[PDB]
């Protein structure tokens, strides 16, 4: 009615999706954090420790969330590696590939 100001970012307004704003947490508490509301399976590398925060542009749905959380590791010095259904958070300055002794196949001996 009277007094039209209104000069405060004291309102976060939540326009129907999640704001983005963390402040330095543990790593695996983000990587829990971003699974809570994009509803994905992450697989934690125990050399996967540090602090996260996710700050982002206006309210995120769940999929641009889990865009910016790959985005957060690239920061954090980790990286998101989809095995499938479920996804594998690992240092990728240690480790972004990794072939693993598995990859010489079946090995099928003719005699």
Same mark, same amino acid.
């Given at each position: !009615? ?12 939540? !326009?129907? +999706?999640?704001?983005? =704003?963390?402040? =330095? #947490?543990? /790593?695996?508490?983000? /990587? #829990?954090?971003?699974?809570? @509301?994009?509803?994905? =399976?992450?697989?934690?590398?125990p050399r996967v420790q ?5 700050? *982002? *542009?206006?309210?995120? +749905? ?13 920061? *954090?010095?980790?990286? #998101? ?8 958070? @690992?240092?990728?300055?240690? #480790? ?16």
């Open positions: !009615m009277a007094h039209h100001h209104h000069h405060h970012v004291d309102d976060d307004d939540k !326009m129907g +999706s999640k704001l983005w =704003n963390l402040r =330095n #947490a543990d /790593i695996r508490a983000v /990587i #829990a954090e971003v699974s809570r @509301i994009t509803g994905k =399976n992450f697989v934690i590398d540090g602090k996260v925060s996710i700050v *982002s *542009s206006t309210p995120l +749905s769940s999929r641009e969330l889990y865009q910016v959380f790959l985005s957060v590791l690239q920061v *954090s010095g980790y990286a #998101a590696i989809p095995n499938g259904e479920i996804i594998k958070i @690992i240092p990728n300055i240690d #480790a972004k590939t990794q072939s693993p002794d598995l990859l010489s196949g079946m090995k099928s001996p003719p005699r």
